[PDB]
Amino acid sequence: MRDKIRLVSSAGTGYFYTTTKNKRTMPEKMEIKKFDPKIRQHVIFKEAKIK
Amino acid sequence: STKNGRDSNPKMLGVKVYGGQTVTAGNIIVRQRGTEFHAGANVGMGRDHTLFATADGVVKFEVKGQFGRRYVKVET
RNA sequence: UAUAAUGGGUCAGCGACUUAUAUUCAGUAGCGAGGUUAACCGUAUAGGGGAGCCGUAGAGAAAUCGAGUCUUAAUAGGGCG
RNA sequence: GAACCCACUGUCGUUGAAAAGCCAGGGGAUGACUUGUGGAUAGGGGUGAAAGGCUAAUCAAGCCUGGUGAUAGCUGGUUCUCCCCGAAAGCUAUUUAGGUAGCGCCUCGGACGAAUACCAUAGGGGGUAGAGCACUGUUUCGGCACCGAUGCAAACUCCGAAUACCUAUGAGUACUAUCCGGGAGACAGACUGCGGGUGCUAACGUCCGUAGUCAAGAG
RNA sequence: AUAGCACUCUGCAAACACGAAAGUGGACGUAUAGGGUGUGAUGCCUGCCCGGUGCUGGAAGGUUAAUUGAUGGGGUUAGCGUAAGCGAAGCUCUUGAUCGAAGCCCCAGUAAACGGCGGCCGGUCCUAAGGUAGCGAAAUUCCUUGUCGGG
RNA sequence: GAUGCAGUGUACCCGCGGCUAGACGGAAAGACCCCGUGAACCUUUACUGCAGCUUGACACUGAACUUUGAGGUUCUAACUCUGUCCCGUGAUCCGGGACGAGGACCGUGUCUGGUGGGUAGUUUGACUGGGGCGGUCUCCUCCUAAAGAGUAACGGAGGAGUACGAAGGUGCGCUCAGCGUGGUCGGAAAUCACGCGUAGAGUAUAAAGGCAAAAGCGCGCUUAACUGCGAGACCCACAAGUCGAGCAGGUACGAAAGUAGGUCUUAGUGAUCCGGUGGUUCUGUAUGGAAGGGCCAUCGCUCAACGGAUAAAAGGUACUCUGGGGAUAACAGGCUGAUACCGCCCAAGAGUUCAUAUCGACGGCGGUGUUUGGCACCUCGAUGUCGGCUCAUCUCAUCCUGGGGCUGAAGCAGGUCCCAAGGGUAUGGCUGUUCGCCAUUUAAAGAGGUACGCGAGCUGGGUUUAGAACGUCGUGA
RNA sequence: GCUGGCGACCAUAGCAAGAGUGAACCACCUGAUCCCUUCCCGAACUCAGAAGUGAAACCUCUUAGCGCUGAUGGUAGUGUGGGAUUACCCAUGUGAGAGUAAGUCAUCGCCAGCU
């Protein structure tokens, strides 16, 4: 089925979100703007292994 | 051996506050699977078609409009 | 259950909700913002012995604060007091 | 074929003369034979030409004493008197279904009184009984899938009650309602009427809803 | 149970059994002996299958234990740094390269080892192989009191 | 299934010899059946240990020569001898001494891999019109469900254990399906144009409730599929679950008023424990650190017997045992009467013609309580039997004998129906039989009830304990 | 008394057929230069304008044609008490659906233009 992934803040705070993804239709790494409560700003979040 | 024998848990739907009763803001008026009743004045609608009151007042049911829809509203 | 469901042949004697410790609630008595000693000593139910226990303040996982405290960027809102 | 060693058939005996026998018949009877005395093998061990047989009238693990007053959601029993109140056999969960736990129902104490109920009036939503064919299916006869007549439906509805249920106001009657604590029992129900599923419109049948009686109630 | 038959193990401080050990039986015996297993005088005999499990013999290929401890990463402090921070040695926590047997995987033989000896409509599929002699309504046959003959 | 209840019939009080129909007679807390998170013993490719057997490493354990860390040859001094001789000694034990044969092997201790029903402790679910076999166990939709909510059955029907970075947000924009005309291939039905009536289309997916500000269908830009919360409600044993205006911060789309805390909604799920990863102004066993713990976020369940007994578990008992149940089965009784048997109504037709002498299709209505069944009310601190023997008693739906009506009744016989229960009503062969077939009789060899009459009156051949064998099933018990 | 816009209401108010309206308003109407526009098209959206027409369209009027509304009486059902068990009857209260008579070619409010 759909695999689990983390989206990690690019500000270096360590904050992250979790979501699912279809690996077949989405081979590339995901990148999306999200809110970061640690710095209270919107920044880009990038995909990472959920481990 | 039968292939039947299943059923789902009850959901407790229906009208919770009838015409003439007084409500406070936030009170749930109708629980409904679809939109059998529509939201009138001072009444809001949730993501599952629940109708709730947004102000204090008295509940009132009616039939209105060109489609003959059933409306519920709150009079302050 | 008259039951054709159980038990008793009859009499006399014996035969089954206890004891210790801890805890909670209710009565009752003493003292009362305080109450009370344990082991022990004591020719000993007395008198000494205040270590300790309960009550007198909560919040928070905790460090910490304290009639407030926790969460939160927030003195906003909210939870326990 | 006698003694001796066995135990194939039948009668009797069965609180026997006898906790395995008597009587009449039966088998072996120089052999893998019978028997006396004294020794050896001890309990998950012994011995067994093997039947789980025998091991002191006890054997799919001897007897005795200790652990020991083993554990038993099971069965039985539980002893003097009077006064007041008074249930349940349901829901949920359970290696759970004849056990138990929380809630529902009982009782006692405290707080607090009309916040409670019956009835009248006023407001309100419904999709059942009945009915119908406008949808979904199904049905008969005509005309040309449609048109005219004609029926049916728990999972059809253009319709649609009586009762039930919620709220507000009010007279009269009544220790009513609610909150906080101590103690429970109960969680195998039965029949009758009404509305139904199942069964054959069978059952003192079975499973639900609703009321009465029994349970726990005599005349 | 039995005489007879067969298989198999045992080279003697025998295999095997009892026992914690010492030791004892086997046996004061020595493969024409001793233990285990199956069959059961005698006559005629004793068919096919080594795919499975077991047993026997090979292989040094793959896998793997204790032992060993190469590398890598942390903790701590002398010192270096305005500070952040950096930081040898010494102790210490951890990681785990290399070496490493039997067994197992692999290859053959063995049925008087445990076992197996078919299906679906002459054909076909599938097997390791598809029942030889002899016997058969039987201590084995449901249908069944099969059918025929004798009494 | 009544000596003791109701109605009624009969009956003066009390022994003795006999008898066994009843006192669900006495005897043994049923052994069959089921239950208990009972027991014992047995089996195995159930789970988990251990003995035994076996492998390697280290120690006891030494020396001298070789070859490509390992292998080889030789030696003796550790160690072995259930080999010879001598002494203790009068001794087939034992010890010391002298030889001989072996020898750094064998063997033993610690550690370690393998094998291991030899032995040991245990497990092997529940519901269930008895139990077993079969099916089911959690979630969603409809009906049953009696117009609020809720409501059971091994009642009637269907779905789920997902999908999507767009199929989410926003601004702007657009309406389906069907039929009829014409128009190349092209038609039943591809696309084009124009009309008619009309929600019958669609909504990722099952059904239901919905859907014009469309919740249906396109395009541009985007990440609100955000962080901290949250007045107030619904539902509810708990644990859980659901809706939500509004406030603060940072965003997206619009000129703007504004809309957005995933998708029309209701299924797409798993508590606690134990661990893993990121962050942290928490703690840190003398002190400074650190290890470990806490808090916030997140990962590992067909724990599907889905409130999840353990990290880890199958069978046999006819060799059996204990505590219980008539809460629950097999026999007989009871209720019922689908089935069974018997009777009646209508009558197509058959009967040379003629429905009704005698049969009678398609349909309909009852009776009985002899069959096969349904239920689980009595009995599990016992109601203890398939057939035969002995002895019976009642019913009539009559087998014989008796009396009659009709006849397709010449006579003799026969057929059918009505009345009638006084009496009577076979012996053998085969088989455990009841039954059945067969042989020969008789006026006839009737059908039923009585705990399928009768075992405290007899038997014990069958079934149903423990022994043994064959076929077949199982690895095995 | 007409026209336009925005509401109340949602068929007694709707459909259908027939007939009228150009002074103003509205509607078609001209072309496409700039703003803007079509998965192509000035067809729609948009801009710049009045040479033509009330043809179409929208409004207004007439008609019971289709549709819609709809009594009274009776029948079915039903709460309480009683009598019976193929699901009825009596007392008392309540009372449909269908069908019949009949009705209907709506009625109001705010603002702005023209007579």
PDB file of N, CA, C and O (backbone and C1' of nucleotides) in Angstrom, chain F residues 5 276 369 399:
ATOM      1  P     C F   5     -57.378 -36.610  50.082  1.00  0.00           P
ATOM      2  O5'   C F   5     -56.994 -35.597  48.916  1.00  0.00           O
ATOM      3  C5'   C F   5     -56.832 -34.209  49.166  1.00  0.00           C
ATOM      4  C4'   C F   5     -57.133 -33.394  47.934  1.00  0.00           C
ATOM      5  C3'   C F   5     -58.525 -33.578  47.348  1.00  0.00           C
ATOM      6  O3'   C F   5     -59.494 -32.767  47.989  1.00  0.00           O
ATOM      7  C1'   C F   5     -56.903 -33.718  45.623  1.00  0.00           C
ATOM      8  P     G F 276      15.786   1.545  23.262  1.00  0.00           P
ATOM      9  O5'   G F 276      15.589   1.950  21.736  1.00  0.00           O
ATOM     10  C5'   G F 276      16.091   1.119  20.701  1.00  0.00           C
ATOM     11  C4'   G F 276      15.590   1.546  19.344  1.00  0.00           C
ATOM     12  C3'   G F 276      15.785   3.006  18.977  1.00  0.00           C
ATOM     13  O3'   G F 276      17.105   3.298  18.553  1.00  0.00           O
ATOM     14  C1'   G F 276      13.603   2.321  18.384  1.00  0.00           C
ATOM     15  P     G F 369     -57.311 -41.203  20.535  1.00  0.00           P
ATOM     16  O5'   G F 369     -55.786 -41.649  20.537  1.00  0.00           O
ATOM     17  C5'   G F 369     -55.403 -42.936  20.070  1.00  0.00           C
ATOM     18  C4'   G F 369     -54.013 -42.921  19.488  1.00  0.00           C
ATOM     19  C3'   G F 369     -52.912 -42.478  20.449  1.00  0.00           C
ATOM     20  O3'   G F 369     -51.722 -43.210  20.182  1.00  0.00           O
ATOM     21  C1'   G F 369     -52.955 -41.042  18.571  1.00  0.00           C
ATOM     22  P     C F 399     -62.002 -58.315   8.321  1.00  0.00           P
ATOM     23  O5'   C F 399     -61.795 -59.879   8.111  1.00  0.00           O
ATOM     24  C5'   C F 399     -60.540 -60.414   7.724  1.00  0.00           C
ATOM     25  C4'   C F 399     -60.368 -61.831   8.213  1.00  0.00           C
ATOM     26  C3'   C F 399     -61.644 -62.635   8.402  1.00  0.00           C
ATOM     27  O3'   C F 399     -62.134 -63.183   7.191  1.00  0.00           O
ATOM     28  C1'   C F 399     -60.216 -62.933  10.270  1.00  0.00           C
TER      29        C F 399
END
